Amino acid sequence: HLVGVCYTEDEAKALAEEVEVQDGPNEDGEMFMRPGKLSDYFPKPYPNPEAARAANNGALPPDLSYIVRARHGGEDYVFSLLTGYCEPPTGVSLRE
Amino acid sequence: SDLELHPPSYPWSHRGLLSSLDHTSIRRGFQVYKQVCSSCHSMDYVAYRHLVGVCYTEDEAKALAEEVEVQDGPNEDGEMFMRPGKLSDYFPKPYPNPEAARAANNGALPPDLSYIVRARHGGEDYVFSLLTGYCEPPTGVSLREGLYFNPYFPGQAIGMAPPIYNEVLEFDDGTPATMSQVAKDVCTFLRWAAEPEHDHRKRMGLKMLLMMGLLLPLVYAMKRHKWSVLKSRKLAYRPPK
Amino acid sequence: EEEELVDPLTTVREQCEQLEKCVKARERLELCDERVSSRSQTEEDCTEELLDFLHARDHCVAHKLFNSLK
Amino acid sequence: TNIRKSHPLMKIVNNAFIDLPAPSNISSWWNFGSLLGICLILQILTGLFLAMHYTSDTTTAFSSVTHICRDVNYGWIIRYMHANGASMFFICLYMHVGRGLYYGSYTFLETWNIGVILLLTVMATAFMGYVLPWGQMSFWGATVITNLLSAIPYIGTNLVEWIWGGFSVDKATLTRFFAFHFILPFIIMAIAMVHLLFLHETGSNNPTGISSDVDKIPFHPYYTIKDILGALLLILALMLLVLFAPDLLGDPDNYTPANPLNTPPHIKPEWYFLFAYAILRSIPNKLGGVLALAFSILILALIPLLHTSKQRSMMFRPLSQCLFWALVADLLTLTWIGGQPVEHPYITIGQLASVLYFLLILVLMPTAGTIENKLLKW
Amino acid sequence: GRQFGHLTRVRHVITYSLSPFEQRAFPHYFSKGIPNVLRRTRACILRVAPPFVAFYLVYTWGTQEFEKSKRKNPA
Amino acid sequence: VAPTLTARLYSLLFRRTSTFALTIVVGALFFERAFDQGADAIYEHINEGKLWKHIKHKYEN
Amino acid sequence: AAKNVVSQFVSSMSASADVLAMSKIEIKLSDIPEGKNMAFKWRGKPLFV
Numbered sequence: 001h002l003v004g005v006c007y008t009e010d011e012a013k014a015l016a017e018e019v020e021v022q023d024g025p026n027e028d029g030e031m032f033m034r035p036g037k038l039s040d041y042f043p044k045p046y047p048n049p050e051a052a053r054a055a056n057n058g059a060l061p062p063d064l065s066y067i068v069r070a071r072h073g074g075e076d077y078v079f080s081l082l083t084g085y086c087e088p089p090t091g092v093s094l095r096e
Numbered sequence: 097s098d099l100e101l102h103p104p105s106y107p108w109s110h111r112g113l114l115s116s117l118d119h120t121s122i123r124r125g126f127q128v129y130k131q132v133c134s135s136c137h138s139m140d141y142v143a144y145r146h147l148v149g150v151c152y153t154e155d156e157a158k159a160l161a162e163e164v165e166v167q168d169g170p171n172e173d174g175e176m177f178m179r180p181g182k183l184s185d186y187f188p189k190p191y192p193n194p195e196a197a198r199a200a201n202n203g204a205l206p207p208d209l210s211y212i213v214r215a216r217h218g219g220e221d222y223v224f225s226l227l228t229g230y231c232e233p234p235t236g237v238s239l240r241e242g243l244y245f246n247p248y249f250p251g252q253a254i255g256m257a258p259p260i261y262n263e264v265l266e267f268d269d270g271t272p273a274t275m276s277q278v279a280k281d282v283c284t285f286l287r288w289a290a291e292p293e294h295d296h297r298k299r300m301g302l303k304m305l306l307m308m309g310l311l312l313p314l315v316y317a318m319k320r321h322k323w324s325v326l327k328s329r330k331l332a333y334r335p336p337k
Numbered sequence: 338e339e340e341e342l343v344d345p346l347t348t349v350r351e352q353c354e355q356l357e358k359c360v361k362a363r364e365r366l367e368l369c370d371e372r373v374s375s376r377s378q379t380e381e382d383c384t385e386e387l388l389d390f391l392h393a394r395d396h397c398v399a400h401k402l403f404n405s406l407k
Numbered sequence: 408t409n410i411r412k413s414h415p416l417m418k419i420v421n422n423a424f425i426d427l428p429a430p431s432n433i434s435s436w437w438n439f440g441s442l443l444g445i446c447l448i449l450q451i452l453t454g455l456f457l458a459m460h461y462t463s464d465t466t467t468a469f470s471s472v473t474h475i476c477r478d479v480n481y482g483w484i485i486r487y488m489h490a491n492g493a494s495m496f497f498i499c500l501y502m503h504v505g506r507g508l509y510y511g512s513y514t515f516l517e518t519w520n521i522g523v524i525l526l527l528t529v530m531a532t533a534f535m536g537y538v539l540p541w542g543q544m545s546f547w548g549a550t551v552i553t554n555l556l557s558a559i560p561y562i563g564t565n566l567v568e569w570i571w572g573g574f575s576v577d578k579a580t581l582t583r584f585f586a587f588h589f590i591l592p593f594i595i596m597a598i599a600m601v602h603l604l605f606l607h608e609t610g611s612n613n614p615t616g617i618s619s620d621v622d623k624i625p626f627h628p629y630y631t632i633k634d635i636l637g638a639l640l641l642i643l644a645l646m647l648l649v650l651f652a653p654d655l656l657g658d659p660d661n662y663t664p665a666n667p668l669n670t671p672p673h674i675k676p677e678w679y680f681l682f683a684y685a686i687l688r689s690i691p692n693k694l695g696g697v698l699a700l701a702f703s704i705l706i707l708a709l710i711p712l713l714h715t716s717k718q719r720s721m722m723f724r725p726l727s728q729c730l731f732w733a734l735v736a737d738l739l740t741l742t743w744i745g746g747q748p749v750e751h752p753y754i755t756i757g758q759l760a761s762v763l764y765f766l767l768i769l770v771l772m773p774t775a776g777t778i779e780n781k782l783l784k785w
Numbered sequence: 786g787r788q789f790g791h792l793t794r795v796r797h798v799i800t801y802s803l804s805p806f807e808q809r810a811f812p813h814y815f816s817k818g819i820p821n822v823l824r825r826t827r828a829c830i831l832r833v834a835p836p837f838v839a840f841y842l843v844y845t846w847g848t849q850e851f852e853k854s855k856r857k858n859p860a
Numbered sequence: 861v862a863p864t865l866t867a868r869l870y871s872l873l874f875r876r877t878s879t880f881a882l883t884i885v886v887g888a889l890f891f892e893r894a895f896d897q898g899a900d901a902i903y904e905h906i907n908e909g910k911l912w913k914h915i916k917h918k919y920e921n
Numbered sequence: 922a923a924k925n926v927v928s929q930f931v932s933s934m935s936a937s938a939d940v941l942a943m944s945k946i947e948i949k950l951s952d953i954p955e956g957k958n959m960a961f962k963w964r965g966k967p968l969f970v
């Protein structure tokens with residue numbers, strides 16, 4: 001997907017090669033590792049949604065592929081979020 | 097190799113047009129599936145609750161599912177633990193990837209059982225004649241010591257070992273586990289797993305024949321009654337002069 | 338296995354295998370059987386005569402079998 | 408005035424099923440038109456209920472079909488009614504075309520030509536139907552068929568790949584076939600209405616092939632009930648098939664999930680294409696085989712131009728009757744051969760039967776008509 | 786189109802009919818009935834039957850040749 | 861008790877299309893039950909393989 | 922007959938592999954402190970404790 005957009009054939013191949021995927025089974029019914037094609041996608045973090053919770057704590061960093069279009073305010077909501085972090089005013093304590 | 101033989105016509109108790117299954121025989125056949133076949137044969141489409149209306153009871157069916165472990169859904173940590181066995185699960189067990197069947201039995205897969213009877217040509221007969229009719233290789237045809245002999249097999253170079261006289265069994269009330277007997281039951285059960293609707297359909301089919309036998313003459317008489325006017329109509333031509 | 342369980346298959350197969358049609362087919366089996374043994378560079382391999390014997394036997398098998406099976 | 412006769416909507420009904428002047432002597436053979444009507448609706452209704460559980464994805468296609476027969480309440484009959492109804496649809500279709508041929512009905516050009524479009528359409532429809540369960544026969548059937556189009560010079564490769572949605576019969580191809588199999592029967596229906604529209608300009612033909620204006624009866628007691636009695640007979644045939652022998656006309660191999668690496672030794676169509684299949688492989692050529700495959704169906708459009716007899720029907724023509732029955736007998740041979748491997752006997756008999764099919768329709772039947780005219784001093 | 790009253794011109798033809806409630810739906814059903822089917826059969830056998838037996842024969846022969854062919858004696 | 865029989869059926873119930881319908885609907889209800897049980901029992905007799913076995917396994921619940 | 926075919930098509934839109942209802946979840950009370958509403962998945966439906 002990046003090829004037509006930003007990078008070139010070569011560059012895009014290379015970036016995929018910097019990860020490992022878990023390719024299909026062979027003769028033994030396996031599950032080995034492969035350099036990375038161009039054909040694969042970007043599904044990586046962790047499997048079950050519950051693992052996100054176990055880690056970050058009962059919260060999931062919502063998938064990025066559709067974020068801009070799923071918020072209300074597009075990139076503005078996200079930009080204002082990321083950039084506009086601030087400090088808690090009076091009487092409102094959090095949960096660290 | 098390019099030469100073949102066709103199975104006989106065994107008098108199954110479910111061969112007749114309006115013939116139910118021997119449900120006691122589906123049991124023992126399930127038993128045969130459970131221990132023997134199961135270790136190599138996947139029956140992906142049958143579940144434990146499917147047996148309830150058929151052979152066993154609620155309680156018994158629960159218990160049989162409880163004698164295995166499934167690998168249930170994830171919890172808080174993103175896990176993958178083990179559970180006793182419901183009634184809701186199916187029978188997918190042997191091994192995951194199809195390649196594992198090959199790695200084991202050697203480049204051969206014991207084809208899934210859930211649809212076998214209906215997928216062969218000859219139903220239970222092909223399978224019965226196969227299982228029961230194992231024999232010895234005649235002149236000049238050597239095998240590959242994993243390629244056993246069966247006359248009822250395309251080419252006759254089969255990858256399955258004859259597992260029917262390994263006398264296992266829990267024929268509860270008392271039924272001898274001879275090669276013949278275990279084979280009838282295993283095929284009787286297989287008919288059922290391939291076509292669970294089998295009996296009910298023949299009950300409807302019975303009713304379809306009785307209804308039709310009542311309806312057909314009646315609609316015919318209705319139509320003849322209305323066509324009467326035309327059938328007995330008499331014509332006369334009376335021209336001038 | 339060694340001695341103890343009475344296979345109805347084996348029982349009814351005897352009486353069956355015997356009979357006329359199969360006597361004759363097994364005759365050709367053995368006839369052809371002994372030809373293939375009697376050589377080296379041959380290939381007429383007896384696969385056919387076996388199946389013919391089996392057919393005749395097996396038809397009679399089915400007809401007489403299941404009756405006793407319980 | 409009445410209500411039936413004047414109301415814009417009821418008029419149509421009245422003019423088509425109530426007061427329609429019908430010949431007093433049409434026989435069973437004329438029932439297949441209403442029976443095709445019933446089969447069309449039966450296919451749509453059971454077809455819709457199946458679509459409420461069926462999945463068009465290779466991952467779950469077969470499983471969803473299995474899910475229907477075990478889990479879905481009464482899912483199994485619906486599934487077999489569908490499957491067997493498709494065959495019933497072809498038995499009726501074949502009776503109908505044959506009836507038209509014997510009786511000279513084809514002289515109603517537009518009606519008949521529309522009928523040819525209706526035949527092609529249900530054929531294209533049923534072919535796509537069979538692929539849906541994603542069985543071994545579904546996939547290899549889908550493969551063998553589509554690939555025929557690759558014989559068309561210079562355009563064939565791109566054409567086959569265009570309808571495939573890839574270089575094989577894959578994901579894109581199954582979903583595709585679902586969509587077309589859903590929309591086609593509705594279009595068929597609109598065409599069946601145009602078929603009936605043209606038919607109405609003249610009314611029906613009859614066994615004698617002689618005009619019947621002199622003795623028409625209302626469709627209103629006579630043919631409503633005769634169609635009723637006849638639909639009941641279609642139900643018997645269908646139900647006999649589904650509640651006693653649901654796989655009799657089916658292939659036990661379409662029960663094994665598609666495997667793009669496993670080519671069954673078998674490989675044959677559903678029975679309704681076996682005659683065309685036999686004609687296709689009778690030719691030791693890629694282009695010619697498919698050119699003659701097509702021509703074995705499109706020839707129905709040449710039939711009215713090859714009518715040569717001074718009488719319309721075959722009722723009074725003996726020589727022509729024999730030739731007709733030899734066509735039906737030749738079509739049994741063709742289907743029988745089509746369902747057999749391309750090895751000994753089968754090649755040359757299926758080769759000669761193909762020639763006979765075309766010698767019969769294209770040369771023999773017309774010649775007989777000329778001879779018959781002559782015997783009658785006409 | 787079509788209608789009744791606009792079909793064609795007919796003269797001097799009388800048609801006696803009887804109500805369906807005054808006659809039987811199956812008059813001589815087996816009596817006159819069966820003779821008629823036999824007569825209809827005679828009239829058509831020589832035109833329908835032959836083509837079919839020609840296939841019946843071609844079918845049984847065709848099958849025999851095929852099955853007998855996959856066998857072999859010397860060479 | 862024979863000529864007057866279908867005569868009464870016509871007089872009391874078939875004349876009006878009202879009763880005619882009411883009678884076949886009342887007639888569809890009873891018939892359904894009689895045909896169902898009556899045909900189940902015929903399917904029951906020619907067999908004896910299904911849930912006649914139930915008496916054993918169950919009850920022990 | 923009409924009843925039966927109609928009833929059967931009507932029934933085809935109800936049950937399935939949807940007889941489930943197992944669940945009977947055992948919930949650890951010390952995991953939910955005072956003032957908190959903890960939601961679980963019970964018989965395909967949200968269960969509040």
Ligand code: HEM
Nearest residue numbers: 132133136201204205206207212223254255256257259282
């Ligand atoms: C009595 C229980 C069993 C039954 C009923 C059964 C039935 C079958 C059937 C019907 C086939 C396919 C026949 C065909 O392809 O035409 C098959 C293939 C096979 N089964 Fe079994 N089987 C049973 C137990 C086993 C066991 C225990 C093993 C492990 C030794 C086994 C290994 C195989 C293999 C390897 C094949 C594939 C043969 C080949 O295609 O090369 N099966 N079986």
Ligand code: HEM
Nearest residue numbers: 437439440441443444507512519522523525526599611612
């Ligand atoms: C969806 C498929 C079809 C439907 C629904 C359909 C429906 C009908 C109906 C309702 C009739 C009037 C009653 C009868 O004679 O049967 C009829 C007559 C006719 N159809 Fe079709 N038919 C279909 C396919 C065909 C085919 C495949 C052909 C031949 C190419 C055909 C050509 C004719 C002709 C010529 C007639 C006039 C027959 C006569 O009056 O003697 N139709 N059709």
Ligand code: HEM
Nearest residue numbers: 450451454455457458461490493496533536537539589592
């Ligand atoms: C728009 C109405 C129709 C719908 C919605 C419909 C939908 C379906 C669906 C979902 C399947 C896959 C499920 C299955 O295989 O049982 C299927 C299979 C099939 N349908 Fe249709 N269809 C319709 C009309 C037709 C027509 C007109 C025909 C042609 C007679 C037809 C012949 C087939 C055939 C041959 C199969 C595959 C054989 C089988 O039942 O397994 N259906 N259809």
Ligand SMILES: COC1=C(OC)C(=O)C(C/C=C(/C)CCC=C(C)C)=C(C)C1=O
Nearest residue numbers: 547548551552675676677680684701704
């Ligand atoms: C793989 O098995 C096969 C089928 O089953 C999937 C078929 O259906 C057919 C024939 C199908 C059609 C549509 C022929 C008509 C063509 C035109 C242009 C009218 C053949 C040959 C076949 O080999």
Ligand SMILES: COC1=C(OC)C(=O)C(C/C=C(\C)CCC=C(C)C)=C(C)C1=O
Nearest residue numbers: 429437438440441444599600611630634
């Ligand atoms: C006088 O000749 C005719 C008949 O007697 C042979 C019929 O039986 C029918 C029956 C047609 C029906 C019921 C319509 C079905 C079409 C669809 C699209 C559902 C027609 C039209 C006809 O002209």
